[PDB]
């Protein structure tokens, strides 16, 4: 039983990677583009971009380990550990050619180590709406003059005693709707049905836990990246960020400038965190144009 509807011309499938069964949705022909979702969501956040991209590329959108229909990782949830699964999955489908990577939210955390360690495998890179884990995350404020901050969830989700699972169980739909809307500019794009679909997926007990284990590993990911970042990224990179409520603003590009030699950035006015859904059309156009400057 599929958790989300598969677009016409795409297939829902599974591959075993290092003993972990990963779910993905795949379609199209041409060079490979891997799209990696973030917290609260699954492969389905890419379902509007995928058919357009499939006109020029082979597109694969996996569920992160433990989320959606993917098994939890057997190593751990730190960025370097999870990136192995995603790198090896992509290499099964693009063994002889570099591939493109698009990532949203914790999809960044779970891909940056394999990008920096396997640069010859990455043709072009698109990152949106999350910091690469580094010491800059320790500067975000706990509280603001307008109320709750954008990043206090880092501490809530990383707390021990299974604090987040214990408080959210039985309230999974309520919490996710609040989380999405508090990080959105355009809340109208989140229909009842769409919120229902995402809530049912991450409410699976192993997926609810998996969601927060990414944050319980966040400081380990920071420490990992402190060593990895001694090597700059050399491939063409684009950053996207919202300019409205929930958006990262100039932070996304300004951080990426410290990591990448060849980077262009855009801030989208009137958009918040959930760019593929809040601002699907301009985000799709910018990704498609950026990736189509390469061979396709």
- For the CB of residue 168, give the shortest distance to its own copies in the complex, in Å: 6
Interaction with its own copies in 104-163: which residues (CB under 8 A)? 135, 137-152, 154-156, 158-161, 163
Residue of 171, 257, 293, 295 that binds its own copies (CB under 8 A): 171
| Residue 95 C-alpha from the chain's centroid | 23
Of these, 32, 82, 115, 218, which contacts its own copies (CB under 8 A)? 218
The reply on whether position 195 binds its own copies by CB under 8 A is no
Residue 203 phi/psi, 5-degree rounding, is: -75, -20
Beta-bridged to residue 20, according to DSSP, are 17
Per-residue CA distances from 1 to 6, 48, 232 (Å):
11, 21, 43
What separation in angstroms does the CA of 195 have from each of 147, 169, 253? 24, 16, 30
Closer Cβ to its own copies, 63 or 172, answer by number: 172
**Beta-carbon count within 10 A of 225 CB:** 22
Number of residues that bind its own copies (CB under 8 A): 36
Q: Which is nearer to its own copies, 147 or 281 (CB)?
A: 147
Between CA 51 and CA 8 the distance in angstroms is 8
Q: Does 222 bind its own copies (CB under 8 A)?
A: yes
Beta carbon nearer to its own copies, 218 or 279: 218
The helix or strand, by DSSP H or E, that contains position 11, with its residue range, turns out to be strand 11-17
Q: Report the interface residues with its own copies, using CB under 8 A.
A: 135, 137-152, 154-156, 158-161, 163, 166-168, 171, 174-175, 178, 182, 218-219, 222
């Amino acid at each position: 039983a599929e958790e989300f509807p598969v677009p016409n011309g795409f297939e829902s499938a599974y591959r075993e990677v290092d003993g972990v069964k990963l779910h993905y949705v795949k379609g199209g022909q041409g060079p490979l583009v891997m799209l990696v979702h973030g917290f609260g969501q699954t492969w389905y956040e890419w379902h509007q971009l995928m058919p357009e991209l499939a006109k020029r590329f082979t597109v694969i959108a996996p569920d992160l380990p433990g989320l959606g229909q993917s098994e939890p990782p057997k190593t751990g949830y730190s960025g370097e550990q999870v990136a192995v699964y995603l790198h090896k999955l992509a290499r099964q489908f693009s063994p002889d050619r570099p591939f493109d990577l698009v990532a949203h939210d914790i999809g960044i955390w779970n891909t940056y180590p394999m990008v920096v360690k396997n640069q010859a495998d990455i043709a072009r890179l698109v990152y949106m709406q999350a910091p690469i884990p580094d010491a800059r995350i320790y500067r975000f404020p706990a509280f603001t003059a307008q109320g709750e901050s954008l990043v206090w969830h880092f501490s809530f989700f990383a707390a021990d005693d299974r604090l987040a699972e214990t408080l959210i169980a039985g309230k999974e739909r309520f919490f996710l709707e609040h989380f999405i809307k508090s990080h959105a500019s355009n809340t109208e794009v989140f229909s009842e049905r769409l919120l229902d679909l995402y809530a049912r997926s991450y409410a699976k007990p192993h997926s609810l836990n998996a969601s927060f284990e990414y944050y319980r590993a966040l400081n380990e990911s920071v420490r990992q990246n402190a060593e990895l970042a001694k090597t700059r990224l050399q491939m063409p990179t684009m950053t996207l960020a919202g300019g409205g409520h929930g958006g990262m603003g100039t932070f996304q590009l300004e951080q990426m400038k410290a990591y990448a030699e060849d980077v262009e950035g855009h801030v989208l006015p009137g958009c918040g965190h959930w760019l593929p859904e809040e601002c699907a059309a301009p985000m799709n156009r910018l990704v498609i144009d950026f990736l189509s400057r390469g061979r396709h």
